[PDB]
Design a protein around this ligand. Structure first.
Ligand SMILES: C[C@@H]1CN(C(=O)c2cnsn2)[C@@H](C)CO1
Length: 150
């Protein structure tokens, strides 16, 4: 009973979280997941400031109100070559990655590793935070509050 959470650097508190190496997070699960990181879904303004500090990914993820990809460099296979905060307009499906915002993080680029999931609750799952440099932090618990997400 294991969940891997791959996380990035933070940029003005905003970071990306991919669960189990595939698009697998619902909107309800995303809010609960950021809450376990003492974080919230970023606002569009918070995401635009993170972008300005150096944040980009090549993966769709929830923010408050939309599903987006922050892009700095145009790449044909990432958000159809767009730059800026690219907003997903048309999709049949409901599961993506998520972004999270931690107000207590540093103001600009923070590429240190994430070493804790401070607000997860008691439960049976081995939850492993996997950093881009491969460093891992694991704990037994749960973060999903909606049964349909389990
Ligand atoms: C990234 C922020 C802070 N954080 C960390 O584990 C951390 C430790 N050192 S740097 N980042 C988690 C609470 C998620 O929200």
């Amino acid at each position: 009973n294991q969940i891997d959470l791959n996380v990035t650097c933070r940029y003005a508190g905003v970071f990306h979280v991919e669960k189990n190496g595939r698009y697998s997070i619902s909107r309800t699960e995303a809010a609960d997941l950021c809450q376990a990181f003492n974080s919230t879904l970023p606002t569009m303004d918070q995401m635009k400031l993170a972008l300005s500090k150096g944040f980009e990914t090549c993966r769709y993820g929830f923010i408050e109100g939309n599903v987006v990809i922050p892009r700095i460099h145009p790449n044909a296979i990432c958000a159809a070559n767009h730059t800026g905060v690219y907003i997903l307009v048309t999709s049949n499906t409901s599961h993506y990655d998520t972004y999270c915002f931690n107000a207590s993080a540093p103001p600009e680029e923070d590429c240190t590793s994430v070493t804790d999931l401070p607000n997860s609750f008691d439960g049976p799952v081995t939850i492993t935070i996997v950093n881009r440099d491969g460093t891992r932090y694991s704990k037994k618990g749960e973060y999903r509050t909606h049964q349909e997400d389990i």
